[PDB]
Amino acid sequence: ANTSSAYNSVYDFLRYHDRGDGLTVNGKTSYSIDQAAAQITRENVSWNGTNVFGKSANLTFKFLQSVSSIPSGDTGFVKFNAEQIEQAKLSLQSWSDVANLTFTEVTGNKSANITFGNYTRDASGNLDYGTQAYAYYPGNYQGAGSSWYNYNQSNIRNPGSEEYGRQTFTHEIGHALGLAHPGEYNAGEGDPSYNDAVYAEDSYQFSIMSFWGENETGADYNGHYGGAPMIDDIAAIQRLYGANMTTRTGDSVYGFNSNTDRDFYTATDSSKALIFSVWDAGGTDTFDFSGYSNNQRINLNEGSFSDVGGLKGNVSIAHGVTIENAIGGSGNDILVGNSADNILQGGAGNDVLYGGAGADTLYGGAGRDTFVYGSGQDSTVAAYDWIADFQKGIDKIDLSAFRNEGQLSFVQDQFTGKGQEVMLQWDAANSITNLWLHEAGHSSVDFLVRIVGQAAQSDIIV
Ligand SMILES: [Ca+2]
Ligand SMILES: [Ca+2]
Ligand SMILES: [Ca+2]
Ligand SMILES: [Ca+2]
Ligand SMILES: [Ca+2]
Ligand SMILES: [Ca+2]
Ligand SMILES: [Ca+2]
Ligand SMILES: [Zn+2]
């Protein structure tokens, strides 16, 4: 019952931002990903009609060059500029990446499902420099799917350099696809706030359809805005149109050295912030967060949140996604794998690595690292872990988790058969050290961790 601090850091991080069940966060009811998704899609409307789910759609979009009138009554129409067009296309792409949607641009007099246009004045003809943007849900009525933005806002005119502009495009397109705010609130109507949120997870950390900052739920993006669908947004849009299983089906790398060709999944250098919820449909994938010096916490479990590059709760993995590998930076990181076979690289700094179930390959990197094992199922003989760069007298292998079944006894070269004993065996021929653990209740030796290098008894934490 007396686990080490290394074990505890993993145990707690695994429960970072727990949600659903009968939990109460910030004095509010906590929603699971699916409950949040249902709430966001409560209008039960999409381009396929009402109460239609898991149905794909082929949609058209258009950059209006002129208008007969804006459905809201606003005036002073202004067409989209070149930068707005490029950014809007990227926002559209971030939605079609995760849901079974196709977007085709149309021009001229052709009608379109989703339209884009700017406004600058109100119905009275007075300049409006206060509002931001709005959009209309799918439907057969005049203006359905149309989105409008205030050209008097610099973030709207320069969405490529002012992050909130791109986020706004993604947000409004969300409405044009059938998504609603996580709560019954609208701009201008009263002075709504996070206090009015129906559930705890109503923030930018979980949905860009929210109006509330990520700080409301404990996350911190240091003034940045993600610009792409977050975890609950992905579940929501997929509920309506189905998941896109053709996206990034090869071996994908997110973060540094990314091969995604998506700005929000790419970090060009250490001064670049990352804010994203990853959707990936196949292949062996890697979270490369090697360019950071900040202490990071990386979790590869689906639905989980990570603390990357000095930010908090800025990276998450969507439900239905399996990410396999992770690379930390020069800081003192915590790398947590999932049930798949993971390759974890701590990088420089003193790191804590936890492979979890499956046959993992672990690299501590330079520094004083700790490889944690919380269960006999973590490294069975049939699917054993490899610690490929273990440093005798420097690194540590943490087995404190087994204390719950009785303190482990270290034996030199033979098992007594009693149980709860650990042994290290050196093979001079291949320079491999086999770490064997005979667990209580096991009639045979079923736990093994193979080490490429030497290891001392004092390197094993029992
Ligand atoms: Ca992939
Ligand atoms: Ca994968
Ligand atoms: Ca590190
Ligand atoms: Ca694993
Ligand atoms: Ca290290
Ligand atoms: Ca090391
Ligand atoms: Ca493992
Ligand atoms: Zn909105």
β-strands 133-135, 146-150 pairing: antiparallel
Please state, in angstroms and rounded to a whole number, the distance separating the CA atoms of residues 72 and 63.
18
315 and 322 Cβ atoms separated by less than 8 Å: no
Of 83, 86, 163, 172, the active-site residue reads: 172
- Which two structure tokens, joined as six digits, stand for 324? 């396999």
315 and 306 Cβ atoms separated by less than 8 Å: yes
State the distance from the centre of ligand 7 to the C-alpha of 363, rounded, in angstroms.
13
In CATH terms, are 2-18+246-462 and 19-245 the same topology?
A: no
State the distance from the centre of ligand 7 to the C-alpha of 213, rounded, in angstroms.
37
- What CATH code would you report for 2-18+246-462? 2.150.10.10
183 and 40 Cβ atoms separated by less than 8 Å: no
> At 286, which helix (H) or strand (E)?
strand 286-288
- Which two structure tokens, joined as six digits, stand for 350? 């003193």
Cβ density class 368-389: b for 16+ within 10 Å, e for less = ebbbbbbebebbbeeebbbbeb
Among all ligands shown, which has an atom nearest to the Cα of 324?
Answer: 2
Domain ranges of the chain: 2-18+246-462, 19-245
Task: Please report the DSSP string for 396-456 in residue order.
Answer: EEE-GGGGGG---EEESS---SSS-EEEEEEETTTTEEEEEEE-TT-SS--EEEEEES---
Please state, in angstroms and rounded to a whole number, the distance separating the CA atoms of residues 379 and 446.
8
> What DSSP designation does 378 have?
G
420 and 438 Cβ atoms separated by less than 8 Å: yes
Q: What is the largest CA-CA distance in the chain?
A: 90
The domain over range 19-245 is classified in CATH as 3.40.50.1370:
no
Read off φ and ψ for residue 141, nearest 5 degrees: -80, 160
Among all ligands shown, which has an atom nearest to the Cα of 383?
Answer: 7
Resolution, expressed in angstroms to one decimal = 1.6
Q: Residue 121: CA atoms inside 13 Å, Cβ hemisphere, count?
A: 10
Structural method: X-ray
Among all ligands shown, which has an atom nearest to the Cα of 373?
Answer: 7
Please state, in angstroms and rounded to a whole number, the distance separating the CA atoms of residues 390 and 221.
35
- Which two structure tokens, joined as six digits, stand for 143? 């203006």
Catalytic site residue 405?
no
Query: Of how many residues is the chain composed?
Result: 462
38 burial level (CB within 10 Å; 0-12, 13-18, 19+): middle
